[PDB]
Design a protein around this motif. Structure first.
Motif: not given
Ligand SMILES: [Zn+2]
Ligand SMILES: [Zn+2]
Ligand SMILES: [Zn+2]
Ligand SMILES: [Zn+2]
Ligand SMILES: [Zn+2]
Ligand SMILES: [Zn+2]
Ligand SMILES: [Zn+2]
Length: 258
Positions: A224, A226-228, A233, A235-236, A238
């Protein structure tokens, strides 16, 4: 994401029918469509979760329309797309194609270097160049992006540099004949398929299982952005929301067709 939302406003405002023109282009060049995806994420450089889904959705659409498609991506994405039996591009050449579409693929900057939304230099072999050549050869090109540093945002670099954080350094210079901007690139991709469906009279997104595709490619190792991390999910955001949007599209399509 204030920045891209302003860019969409500025863009839609003066290019009011961009999705429509994009869809016309699509529907007019299905013979042999090359789909490029895969956005490495620094520092791990592993392909992100946003992109491959859109790429797949479009792929399935090109076939349902009696066309041929091939995907050009990175190792990890190929691995994650296997279960869906997608045709991979083996040493591709611009001339061999009817149309070349891009769903969330790093686009070269004014530097001549590649950058992440956080401005971290992406260090991996680019999938960039075929679009430059396709441009020079006048081969139909469509790019889909949601942050300003992707393939095709070159068409509105000004908007990007004017609203997106890190714009000057990050904004891509690579242009595409038509461009779809979105909050999440897979959504833009689903928009194309949605719009194409309406124009054609059939709902090409009918059996799309958004949850099944994201969980799937996530398990294969696609992270993901954003959260890498390895979360189911995009782009962060859900699945709940992503499902909400794909359900809406499908609905707008049936509303027009029926
Ligand atoms: Zn503006
Ligand atoms: Zn050849
Ligand atoms: Zn920042
Ligand atoms: Zn992006
Ligand atoms: Zn994205
Ligand atoms: Zn029309
Ligand atoms: Zn992302």
């Amino acid at each position: 994401n204030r920045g891209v939302l302003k860019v969409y406003l500025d863009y839609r405002r003066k290019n009011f029918n961009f999705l429509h023109n994009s869809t016309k282009m699509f529907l007019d060049n299905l013979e042999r469509v090359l789909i490029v995806t895969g956005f490495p994420i620094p520092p791990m450089m592993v392909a992100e979760t946003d992109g491959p889904p859109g790429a797949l959705a479009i792929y399935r659409a090109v076939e349902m329309l009696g066309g041929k498609a091939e995907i050009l991506t990175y190792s990890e994405v190929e691995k994650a797309l296997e279960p869906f039996g997608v045709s991979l591009a083996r040493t591709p050449e611009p001339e061999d194609y009817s149309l070349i579409i891009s769903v969330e693929t790093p686009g070269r900057a004014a530097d001549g270097r590649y950058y992440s939304m956080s401005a971290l230099e992406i260090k991996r072999d680019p999938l960039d160049g075929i679009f430059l050549k396709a441009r020079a050869l006048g081969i139909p090109t469509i790019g889909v992006g949601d942050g300003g540093n992707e393939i095709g945002m070159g068409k509105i670099r000004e908007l990007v540099v004017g609203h997106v954080p890190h714009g000057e350094k990050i904004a891509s210079v690579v242009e595409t004949d038509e461009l779809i901007v979105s909050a999440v690139s897979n959504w833009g991709a689903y928009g194309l398929v949605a719009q194409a469906s309406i124009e054609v009279g059939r709902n090409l997104l009918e059996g799309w299982d958004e949850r099944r595709v994201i969980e799937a490619i996530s398990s294969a190792g696609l992270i993901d952005g954003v959260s890498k991390t390895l979360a189911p999910s995009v782009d962060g955001i859900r699945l709940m929301v992503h499902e909400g949007i794909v359900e809406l599209l499908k609905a707008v399509v049936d509303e027009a067709i029926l």
